[PDB]
Amino acid sequence: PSIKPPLIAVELENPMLGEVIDLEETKAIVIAAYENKALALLFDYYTGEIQINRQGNTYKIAVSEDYIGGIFNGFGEPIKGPKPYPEDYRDINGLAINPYARKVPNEILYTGISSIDVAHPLLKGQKIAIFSPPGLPMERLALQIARNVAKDKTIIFAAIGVPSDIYKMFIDEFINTKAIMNSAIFISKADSSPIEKIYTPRVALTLAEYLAFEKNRDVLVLMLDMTNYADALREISTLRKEIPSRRGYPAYLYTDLASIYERSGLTSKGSITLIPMLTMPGNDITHVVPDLTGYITEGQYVLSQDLHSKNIYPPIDLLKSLSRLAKNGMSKKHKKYADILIKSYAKGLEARDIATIVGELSKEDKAYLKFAELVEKEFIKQDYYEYRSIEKSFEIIDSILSQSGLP
Amino acid sequence: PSIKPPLIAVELENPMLGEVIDLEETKAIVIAAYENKALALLFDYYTGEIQINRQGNTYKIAVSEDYIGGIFNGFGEPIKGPKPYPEDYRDINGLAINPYARKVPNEILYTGISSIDVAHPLLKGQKIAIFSPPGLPMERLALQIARNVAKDKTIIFAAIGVPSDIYKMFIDEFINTKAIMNSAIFISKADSSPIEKIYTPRVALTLAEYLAFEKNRDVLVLMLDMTNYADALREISTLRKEIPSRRGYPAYLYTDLASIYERSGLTSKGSITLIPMLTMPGNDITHVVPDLTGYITEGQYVLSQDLHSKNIYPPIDLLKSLSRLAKNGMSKKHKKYADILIKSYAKGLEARDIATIVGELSKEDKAYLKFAELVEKEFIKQDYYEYRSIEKSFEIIDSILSQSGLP
Amino acid sequence: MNRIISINGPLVIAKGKFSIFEVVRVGEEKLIGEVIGIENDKAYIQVYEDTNGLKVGEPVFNTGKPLTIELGPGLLANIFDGLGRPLKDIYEKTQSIYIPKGIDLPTLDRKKVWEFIPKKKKGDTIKGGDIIGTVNENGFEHRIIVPPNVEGKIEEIYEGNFTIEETIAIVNGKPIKLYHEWPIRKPRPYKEKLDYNYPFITGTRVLDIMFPIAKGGSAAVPGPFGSGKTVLNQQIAKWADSDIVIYIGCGERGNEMTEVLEEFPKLKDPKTGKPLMYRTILIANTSNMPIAAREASIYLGATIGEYFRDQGYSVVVNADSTSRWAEALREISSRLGEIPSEEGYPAYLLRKLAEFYERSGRVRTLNDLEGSLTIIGAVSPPGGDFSEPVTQNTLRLVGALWALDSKLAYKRHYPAINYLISYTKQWEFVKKYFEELYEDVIEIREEFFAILKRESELMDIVSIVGALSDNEKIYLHMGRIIREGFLQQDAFDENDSYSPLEKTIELMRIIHKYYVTVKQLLGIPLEEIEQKGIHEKIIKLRYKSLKEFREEIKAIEQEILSL
Ligand SMILES: Nc1ncnc2c1ncn2[C@@H]1O[C@H](COP(=O)(O)OP(=O)(O)O)[C@@H](O)[C@H]1O
Ligand SMILES: [Mg+2]
Ligand SMILES: [Mg+2]
Ligand SMILES: [Mg+2]
Ligand SMILES: [Mg+2]
Ligand SMILES: [Mg+2]
Ligand SMILES: [Mg+2]
Ligand SMILES: [Mg+2]
């Protein structure tokens, strides 16, 4: 046999792909199988010899509402203490939803955040990512959203390989806002086995699908950081002697990310609203992780280093951001305000670019220039504890339009 | 044995490199040989088992004037119907021409196209490529050239993996201009085996060498698209477990391209004038295919996206284009006009660059600016059905020089 | 007897006796697979279902048949997966919202009763591809064409109400059904390729005038994420002048297929008044459905397209997105341990893409009718870099580039077509049509291109003051009008979503009329001309009903009183 943690090479009669095997002090997942040769990934630190007990099945979790109020690891095992009821066991990979069975999201979930609600509103059942440069307050943004759109919903938080400072920031806010009792938290530590990291969003979404589509609930799922998830997938892909693609990432990265993101949506019985969060490595949106995620999620909220440097929270780029399904939920009045905001801000930014030339150009172009300045100062800029009704957000736009000289 | 089309792995006693083998419903070419193991490439779609009959020779074609007036596939097999006379069989790879036996091209073939004839004339026996961005009328340019320089010559057209719209455009024009009866056409479809694609220019040039150097004729060879040819070569190179070079292309790409392009030229008995056409992938002339082709052909006509967007046909870049042997065929008067056109246009373009700054600068530099504008509008711009004598082209230059204020 | 010896993602290796391209059933759960390679006693099989949980100790079953699709009544207005399995029936059988692994159902409804009206008599001789009769499929005249390989005398032919599995005729002792099976990897035969003839009218202005293709042509639509590929293809699927529309969701969002299911039954064909769904076939293999089934969905949709083409109809196939099919090829190639070529894609990428696009074209059918298959392929280049293999290979196969642009999408200019980079190679075949029915549109088209190009040349100088002369400013003025009033088209406005040629032509004419007037008036300043606000009225035109559009144009024409 062979050991180089977290990898073991082992001899098995008729190996099963994905099979869970019991060792003395730990478990493993079979990730490769040829004839009677198997490769397996250890759940955790192991050093003992490799006597094997085969479960004869792929990894499953018992699904119930017992998880609600609890904190678990990436395998769904309790950290806080009490085990949920065994069983009703489910494949953590789950199944693809039939698009015939879907309903297209059409109901706006108001966040109270102007830079989101007006032009890029989140809809119930939508999947939408937050893209952030390293260092920017992506966590605060997610928490402020969760605080306002999940007052009536179960929150599921998947922490994928983030440092303790990060996942404790979430836990503490959920506790202080009293959302902790209606939350299920799944945590894989940064130094954990890659198999625990990639299982984290799978067990969280398996629970989410149970709660939403069997218990008929509306569910909010937050997950962070997808860049750490991709890293774990690459680690496993490389342990298997797979032929690497761009930057070592596996060729099926898009398909694997989709097998997570697409486990969301709206049906007649319930909904899963999904917000994946990722760090754009070199603040490069064309990096494979944010790029593939962009091709899958139904839009994204993009954070801006420039706005952050101007002391603007939340530092949302109004033009790089997008909500694909937004129009489905907007009134004609709402559509009018979104269009006027987006188009005038863009024209204002163009006028700003040439202002590093002609300095201060056209009267019309001086009005748009001021509009963009005020949008960032009075519309986008907003306190972490501030909630704005959509009517209040419209009023701000009206006020800025007057100050600027625009209609 | 092994089958994964178009590749078969097969056991042979003393395999011959390049050997043709007969199967039930098809043929194959041995592309690799170690001891008694051979790899072969199927001519076409095959599914039956792999009983083998060895021809004991590499691929050959019967050479004769029977091909003239006919349409054939990449293997030289008739599409229209009647087989040419067997045999007088020739290795389709042919042999290198002895440079001692060559004569340097010195006779201009007038195209009637001003942007070519004045500064970059084509000479009889010359090899010169057309480089085009995707979408630009490279096909129309080749046809307009063929219409005027091959009234007395056999035209051989090699279509390498181009869509039906493209090769039918050629066939239909040859038919409408009545050049079809003095033409031989070789076509490999876009979805054909890579072995048929790389044999297409070889069978066409084998015929060309026979017609030109045995039957003492002047021959015009057109081939398109060399980028598809390189793709097929890479496909074969990768099937062989060869160590890939830049972008997967084989290390010997230059040498293989040369083994095609250099089968052209002038001798005391006859001539092969060769015009290879290629698409520059991302409109990037530094891409390996146009770059290597540039290092081999005796110049190139480069098409311009900018001129195309200005509704200029033919969209020839006068400065990026080159005919290496042009000077060999030009009179002193012709040389004078070419020099004045090239140098003044270049100076005009420089003046144009700064015109996006000083706007409208020097008197002298205003004259060159106008010259470049008129060159593109009155000299380069020309109808697809328009023929200009070299004298007419000189007259246009004279007229533009006066309008511009230049001598 | 046959046994699995390895499982590696979508690739299964089995020992036993197999044939190349034979469909096999893998494991005890009998998952659909296809043999793609054979090495001695081993077979390399791509599985069209999830392979997690499969065991080396499991059998593989032969079928002796290739991958096929049922062609007949029952396809229209329905949604199928990549293998041709009806998603509505899957939902109803399972009573679940999930797609089960291993479920097998027939493609065409076996209980639906059709009315067959014969077009041949007893004793008639029939050859392959002949129309033996017709079936009304909710307003569509479905032509029952006999398989290409059947020929002989009609010994018996019936009439009336039948289900799909019932014999409707007998030829040379062989039963004929309302349907036949066809291998999706095999192009359907025809008599000859025909010349282009007629433009492909989409209902989208930029695609109809600026960069049109002919019926039977093909186009590529590459763009970065969020640039508008899916909406553009759906707009074409909605309003295209076509008998049949096939939308292939290849590796994209489930909600986008659901969107079509929700909206198309509410929309009316502007040519028949019938609802759009009745001419539409949906093929859905979403991003998280089995990866190998993406390849199947592409060949499947093409085959169905050829089938309706063979009936003498015009068909359009929209494929969104072809990059996902390329990913599937790359993944299979990787598991097979093939040496990757450029960007990790297999070296045969171009050849594979060609197997799809070369199926497009206008043809003389086996039954001597004219039919066309038009193919629109969306491409999803990583990071929006067009220099990548999928985009570049596709550009050497298709007849037009409809390039989507980040900068336009950024400022909400939709369709975000880059009018400097995009092209059509088929204008020479369709300009005839426009000339005849609209004399001056060829000149105005050239004029639009000239203005957009000149405006482009000027915007770099503008980065040094916006100081320009009136003769230059007029290009920024007209360019804005063309961009905001003609090129831009709101897919989700009730009035602007569809643009018939009358509206398209009239817009060109009023813009051109404004242009010739403004030019004549240069020599009063531009500042005073813009104050009249005629340009802002023209820009708002596209948002008007039709019987408000015509009225406003009359209003604008007078207001162009340069007297
Ligand atoms: N013609 C159009 N009119 C209005 N909105 C559009 C149009 N085209 C695209 N959009 C908007 O742009 C966004 C992205 O479009 P989509 O087709 O999903 O992009 P892609 O498929 O290229 O990722 C969507 O939110 C859509 O509403
Ligand atoms: Mg149980
Ligand atoms: Mg289960
Ligand atoms: Mg002989
Ligand atoms: Mg010889
Ligand atoms: Mg229904
Ligand atoms: Mg899309
Ligand atoms: Mg068509």
Task: Write a three-state SS string for C410-462.
Answer: HCCCCCCECCCCCEECCHHHHHHHHHHHCCCHHHHHHHHHHHHHHHHHHCCCC
C274 and C228 in one domain? Answer: yes
> DSSP class of residue B326?
G
Instruction: Indicate the helix (H) or strand (E) that contains C383.
Output: none
**8 A C-beta contact, residue A388 and residue A144:** no
Rg of chain B, C-alpha, whole Å: 23
Asked if residue C434 and residue C467 are part of one domain, the reply reads yes
Q: Are strands B2-4 and B7-11 parallel, antiparallel or unpaired?
A: antiparallel
CA distances (Å), origin C252, targets A256, A294, A333, C235:
13, 12, 31, 17
In the chain, the amino acid numbered C457 is: E
Q: Which residues lie across from A273 on neighbouring strands?
A: A220
Task: Give residue B194 CA to ligand 8 midpoint distance, Å.
Answer: 30
Domain range for C46 is 1-67
CA distance B111 to B323: 14
Contact present, C277 and C308 (Cβ < 8 Å): no
Ligand 1 atom with least separation from CA of A323:
25
Helix (H, G, I), strand (E, B) or coil at C521: helix
Q: What is the rounded end-to-end Cα distance, in angstroms, of chain C?
A: 93
CA distance C360 to C375: 6
Q: Is C293 helix (H, G, I), strand (E, B) or coil?
A: helix
Tell me how far CA of residue B89 lies from CA of B64, B95, B154, B203, C36, in angstroms: 10, 14, 21, 11, 37
Terminal CA-CA length for chain B? 76
CB B154 within 8 A of CB B68: yes
The CB density around residue C492, as the number of other CB atoms within 10 Å, is: 12
Cβ atoms of B401 and B407 closer than 8 Å = yes
What the block records as the tokens of C34 is: 């296809």
Cα gap B316→B334, rounded to integer Å: 19
The answer to whether B52 and B11 are in contact (CB under 8 A) is no
Q: Do B2 and C386 touch (CB under 8 A)?
A: no
Q: How far apart are CA A364 and CA B38, in angstroms?
A: 75
How many angstroms separate the CA atoms of C7 and A30, rounded? 11
Contact C166, C177 (CB under 8 A): yes
Contact C379, C394 (CB under 8 A): yes
The set of residues, in sequence order, having a beta carbon less than 8 Å from that of B335 and lying 6+ positions away, is: B327
Kindly report the number of other CB atoms within 10 A of residue A393's CB atom. 24
Distance CA C222, CA C385 (A): 9
Q: Partners of C506 in the beta sheet? A: none
Residue B17: both structure tokens together: 């490199």
Distance CA A197, CA A190 (A): 8
* Total tally of structural domains belonging to chain B: 1
* Closest alpha carbon to B222 in B114, B113, B143: B143
Q: How far apart are CA C451 and CA C375, in angstroms?
A: 31
Distance CA C539, CA C483 (A): 9
Among residues B217, B276, B220, the alpha carbon closest in space to that of B65 is found at B217
- Residues B220, B65: Cα–Cα separation, whole Å: 15
d(CA C134, CA C168): 11
B305 contacts in C (CB within 8 Å)?
421
Domain with residue C143: its CATH number is: 2.40.50.100
The tokens for A202 are 């799978």
Geometric angle at alpha carbon C114, from C112 and C115, rounded to 5°: 160
- In angstroms, this model's resolution equals 2.0
Distance CA C4, CA A337 (A): 60
Deposited experimental method: X-ray
- Alpha-carbon gap, residue A151 to A167, rounded angstroms: 20
Residue window 281-320, chain B: list those with CB within 8 Å of chain C. Answer: 281-282, 284, 305, 309-311
Looking at the DSSP bridge assignments, the partners of residue C35 are C45
DSSP state of A247: G
Chain A residues inside the 8 Å CB shell of C411: 319, 342-343, 346-347
Helix, strand or coil, per DSSP, at residue B274: strand
Sign of CA dihedral C520, C524, C525, C530: negative
Give the number of the ligand closest to the Cα of residue B210.
5
| Atom from ligand 1 closest to the CA of residue C415 | 1
Between the CA of A82 and the centroid of ligand 1 the distance, in Å, is 48
Q: Select from C223, C233, C213, C219 the least CA-distant residue to C401.
A: C219
Q: What gap in Å lies between CA C328 and CA C346, rounded to an integer? A: 11
Show the tokens assigned to B222.
């057109």
Distance (Å, whole) CA B161 – CA B189: 5
Residues C73 and C125 in one domain: no
Beta bridge partners of A42: A28
Q: Please, what is the Cα angle at A388 between A383 and A390, to 5 degrees?
A: 150
Interface of C with B in 58-117 (CB under 8 A): none
Q: How far apart are CA B155 and CA B146, in angstroms?
A: 8
CB distance C228 to ligand 1 below 6 Å? yes
Question: What 3-state DSSP class applies to A149?
Answer: helix
SS (H, E, C) B121-149: CEECCCECEEEECCCCCHHHHHHHHHHHH
Residue C363 CB partners (closer than 8 Å, separation 6+): C190, C191, C192, C193, C194, C216, C309, C370, C371, C372, C373
User: Which ligand has an atom closest to residue C240 CA?
Assistant: 8
Question: Could you give the angle at the alpha carbon of A20 between the alpha carbons of A15 and A21, nearest 5°?
Answer: 80
How many helical (H) and strand (E) elements, i.e. helices and strands, does chain A have? 11, 19
Do the Cβ atoms of C101 and A95 come closer than 8 Å? yes
Contact criterion met (CB below 8 Å) for B313 and B114: no
Other C-beta atoms lying within 10 Å of the C-beta of residue B178: 8
Interchain contact, A254 vs C327, CB within 8 Å: yes
Alpha-carbon span C156 to B195, nearest angstrom = 49
Crossing angle for the helix pair A332-354 and A390-404, nearest 10 degrees?
A: 40
Count CB neighbours of C194 within 10 A. Answer: 15
Q: Which helix (H) or strand (E) holds B112?
A: none
Phi-psi region of C192 (alpha: psi -120 to 50; beta: other; left: phi over 0): beta
User: With the C-alpha atoms ordered A246, A252, A256, A258, is the resulting torsion angle positive or negative?
Assistant: positive
Residues 6+ apart with CB under 8 A from B166: B139, B159, B224
Name the one residue in this structure whose structure tokens are 């489910």: A90
From the list A61, A66, A14, the residue with the least C-alpha distance to A38 is: A14
Mutate to test the pocket of ligand 1, among A293, A301, A324, A339 (most ligand atoms within 8 A of CB): A324
DSSP structure class, residue A103: B
Q: Which of C335, C447, C389 is nearest to C46 (CA)?
A: C335
Please state, in angstroms and rounded to a whole number, the distance separating the CA atoms of residues B165 and B159.
12
Residue B358 phi, psi dihedral angles, 5° rounding: -65, -15
CA distances in angstroms from C113 to C73, C108, C178, listed in the order given:
10, 12, 11
C-beta separation of B273 from B149 below 8 A = yes
Q: Are B199 and B92 in contact (CB under 8 A)?
A: yes
Smallest CA–CA distance, residue C393 to chain A, in Å, is 19
In angstroms, rounded to a whole number, what is the distance separating the alpha carbons of residues A29 and A92? 13
Strands, E assignment, B74-125:
89-91, 108-109, 122-123
C273: left (phi over 0), alpha (psi -120 to 50) or beta: left
Q: Which amino acid is located at B44 in the chain?
A: D
Q: How far apart are CA C252 and CA A262, in angstroms?
A: 10
Give kind and range of the element (H or E) at residue A224. strand A218-224
C-beta separation of C356 from C375 below 8 A: yes
Looking at chain B, the number of H-run helices and the number of E-run strands are 11, 19
List all residues 6 or more positions away from A334 whose beta carbon is below 8 Å from its beta carbon: A118, A390
Structurally, chain C folds into a number of domains equal to: 4
Q: Left (φ > 0), alpha (ψ -120 to 50) or beta: where does A69 sit?
A: left
Same domain membership, residue C141 and residue C52 = no
Compute the distance from residue C79 Cα to the ligand 7 centre, in Å. Answer: 18
In whole angstroms, give the CA distance from residue A328 to residue A89: 37
CA B60–ligand 4 middle distance (angstroms): 10
- Give, rounded to a whole angstrom, the gap between the first and last alpha carbons of chain A: 76
What is the distance between the alpha carbons of residues A288 and C325, in angstroms, rounded to a whole number? 18
Among the candidates C424, C451, C476, a domain finishes at C424
Task: Report how far residue B213's alpha carbon sits from residue B272's, in angstroms, rounded to the nearest whole number.
Answer: 9
Distance from the Cα of residue B83 to its chain's centroid: 26
- Distance (angstroms) between ligand 1 centre and the Cα of A321 equals 13
Residue closest to B330 by CA, chosen among B348, B342, B319: B342
* C384 shares a domain with C463: no
Measure the CA–CA gap between A74 and A60, rounded to whole angstroms. 12
**Cα–Cα nearest to A200, from A163, A165, A234, A156:** A156
Sign of the Cα pseudo-torsion (B349, B353, B354, B360, in order): positive
A382 vs A389: CA distance, rounded Å: 13
Same domain, C234 and C323: yes
Dihedral angle of Cα B176, C364, B25, B28, to the nearest 10 degrees: 50
Same domain (yes/no): C142, C203: no
CB atoms closer than 10 angstroms to residue C89: 18
Q: Output the six-digit token pair for C379.
A: 């491409």
Do C84 and C47 lie in one domain? The reply is no
- Long-range contacts of the stretch C453-456 (C-beta < 8 A, 24+): C453/B309, C453/B310, C453/C420, C454/C479, C455/C479, C456/C420
If asked whether residues C383 and C482 sit together in one domain, one would say no
Q: Residue C267: what are its φ and ψ, rounded to 5°?
A: -100, 150
User: Rounded distance, CA B235 to CA B231, Å?
Assistant: 6
Mutual angle of helices B138-149 and B164-176, in 10-degree steps = 30
Euclidean distance between CA atoms C202 and A233, whole angstroms? 43
Residue with tokens 């030339």: A357
Residue A90 Cα distances to A61, A207, C288, angstroms: 6, 9, 18
The first and second tokens of residue A145, run together, are 């959203």
Closest CA to C317 of C386, C262, C252, C240: C240
Amino acid at B95: L
Q: Give the domain extent around B341.
A: 1-407
User: Are C184 and C307 in a shared domain?
Assistant: yes
Q: Where are the alpha helices (DSSP H) in A214-362?
A: 226-239, 253-261, 288-294, 305-309, 332-354
Pocket test for ligand 1, best of C227, C231, C406, C407 (most atoms within 8 A of CB): C231
Q: What is the maximum alpha-carbon separation in chain A? A: 82
Enumerate the β-bridge partners of residue C320. C249
Residue type at B159 in one-letter notation: A
CATH (domain of B219): 3.40.50.12240
The residue whose C-alpha atom lies closest to atom 1 belonging to ligand 1 is C491
Do chain A and chain B touch with ≥3 beta carbon pairs under 8 Å? no
- How many whole angstroms separate alpha carbon C314 and alpha carbon C307? 11
Whether C and B touch (3+ CB pairs < 8 Å), yes or no: yes
Closest CA to C27 of A35, C107, C6: C6
DSSP element (H, E) containing C132: strand C131-137
Judgement on whether residues C78 and C226 belong to the same structural domain of the protein? yes
Spatial CA neighbour of C324 closest among C353, C294, C297: C294
Tell me, what DSSP letter sits at residue C36? E
Before C415, cis peptide (omega within 30)? yes
Q: How many Å separate Cα C423 from the centre of its chain?
A: 18
Distance CA(B346)–CA(B360), nearest Å, equals 18
Which of C176, C203, C227 terminates a domain? The answer is C176
Element (H, E) at B157: strand B154-160
Are residues C437 and C310 part of one domain?
no
Distance CA A357, CA C465 (A): 7
How far is Cα C439 from Cα C130, in angstroms, rounded to an integer? 41
**Closest residue by Cα to residue B309 from C450, C478, C211:** C450
Helix, strand, coil share (%) of chain C residues, nearest 5? 35, 25, 40
C 183-202 residues with CB below 8 A of A? none
Which ligand 1 atom is nearest residue C416's CA?
Answer: 8
d(CA A358, CA C343): 44
CB burial of B372-382 (b: ≥16 within 10 Å; e: otherwise) equals bebbbeebbbb
Phi/psi region, residue A300 (left: phi>0; alpha: psi -120 to 50; beta: rest), is beta
* Chains in touch with A (≥3 Cβ pairs < 8 A): C
Sorted by sequence, the CB contacts under 8 Å of residue C92 that are 6+ apart come out as none
User: Residue C373: beta bridge partners?
Assistant: C315, C361
Whole-angstrom distance, CA of residue A340 vs CA of residue A334 = 10
